[PDB]
Amino acid sequence: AVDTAEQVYISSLALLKMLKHGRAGVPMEVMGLMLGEFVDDYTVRVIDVFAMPQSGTGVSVEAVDPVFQAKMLDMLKQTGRPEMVVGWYHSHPGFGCWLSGVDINTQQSFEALSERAVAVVVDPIQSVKGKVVIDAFRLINHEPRQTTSNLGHLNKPSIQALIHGLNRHYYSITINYRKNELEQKMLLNLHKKSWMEGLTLQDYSEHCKHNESVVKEMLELAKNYNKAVEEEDKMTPEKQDPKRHLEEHVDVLMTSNIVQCLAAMLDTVVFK
C-alpha cells in the first residue's frame, strides 16, 4: 500500500562503515550498498554495509559492478550474512545531504529493482566534531505519503535539500540507530579510562604552573569584580566578565587541586 512516516534503522557497524568509506573517498564521491531486511511497511532495517570499487564514472548506476556485487553477496552468504540488499549510500563532501539529478535516477533504478530501496547521503567532511550529517531519501511516483502518525514531524528538514528537492522529487525518511547493549560499552572501551590513568598523579611541576596561572587570572578577574561591585548604583539597569568567569575559575582550580591532593594521598598510603 501507500507508504507512511516510516523509519530506517541502521546499525553501528553500518554507520561506521559508511563514515569510514566516505572519509576515505573525499574529495571524490564514493558509493556502496547496505544489506538489510524489509521487516515491514513502517520501517526498513539495514545491517552491515559494503563499499564497492570507485570507477571513473563517478556515483552512477554504471559505477555498480554487477560481478563485484554478485560475488560479494555470494561470499557474504557463505560467511554467514544472507542479508538481501536494499539501500545504497553515497558521499557528498563539501555540500549537504540531498539527491542530485544523477542520484534521482540511480535511486529510480534501485527502486525499480526491489520497490522500497532507500537512498542514503553522507557528507564525510561535514560529519565531524560529533555531528553526523546523514540522511535517507526515497522517490515519489497529490499525496506524497500517508501521515498516520506524529513520528514524521519530530524532525525538521533543511533548506539545502529543500531547494534540491527534499520534498519536491524525493522525500527524506527519519533515520534511527539500532545500537544494542553489547555494542554499547564495547565501543566505550575506546575512551574508557584505564585504572593506571585513574591513579596517575599528573605532573607536579605542571600542576604548580597551572595553579600559578589560574590564581593570577583569579587576581585579574577580582580586580574588575571590585569595580563591578563598586558600580552597584543601578544606572540604566542592564553576563560578561567578572562573576561567572570567577565562578568557572574557582570551580576548575578547586577540583584540580582536590583531585591532585586525593590522588597523591591515595598513592602515598596504598602503594606502600
The site for Zn ion (CB under 5 A) is made up of: 59, 90, 100, 103
- Residue 164 is assigned to a ligand binding site: no
Q: Hey, how many other C-beta atoms are within 10 angstroms of the C-beta on 137? A: 22
Only one of the segments 79-87, 103-111, 113-121, 142-150 lies at the binding site for another protein (rule: CB under 8 A); that segment is: 79-87
CB 19 within 8 A of CB 132: yes
Q: Hey, how many other C-beta atoms are within 10 angstroms of the C-beta on 64? A: 20
For position 238 contacting another protein by CB under 8 A, the verdict is no
For position 72 contacting another protein by CB under 8 A, the verdict is yes
**Three-state secondary structure call for residue 99:** coil
- Residue 103 is assigned to a ligand binding site: yes
For position 113 contacting another protein by CB under 8 A, the verdict is no
For position 48 contacting another protein by CB under 8 A, the verdict is yes
C-alpha cell at 37: 531486511
Q: Which of 40, 41, 42, 68 binds another protein (CB under 8 A)?
A: 68
For position 270 contacting another protein by CB under 8 A, the verdict is yes
Q: How far apart are CA 139 and CA 116, in angstroms?
A: 9
Q: How far apart are CA 233 and CA 106, in angstroms?
A: 69
For position 12 contacting another protein by CB under 8 A, the verdict is yes
For position 102 contacting another protein by CB under 8 A, the verdict is no
- Residue 142 is assigned to a ligand binding site: no
Identity (one letter) of the amino acid at 258? I
Only one of the segments 101-109, 136-144, 147-155, 196-204 lies at the binding site for another protein (rule: CB under 8 A); that segment is: 196-204
The CA dihedral of 241, 242, 248, 251, to the nearest 10 degrees, is 170
**Three-state secondary structure call for residue 165:** coil
Of Zn ion, another protein, none, which one sits near residue 204, judging by CB under 5 to 8 A according to partner kind?
another protein
For position 47 contacting another protein by CB under 8 A, the verdict is yes
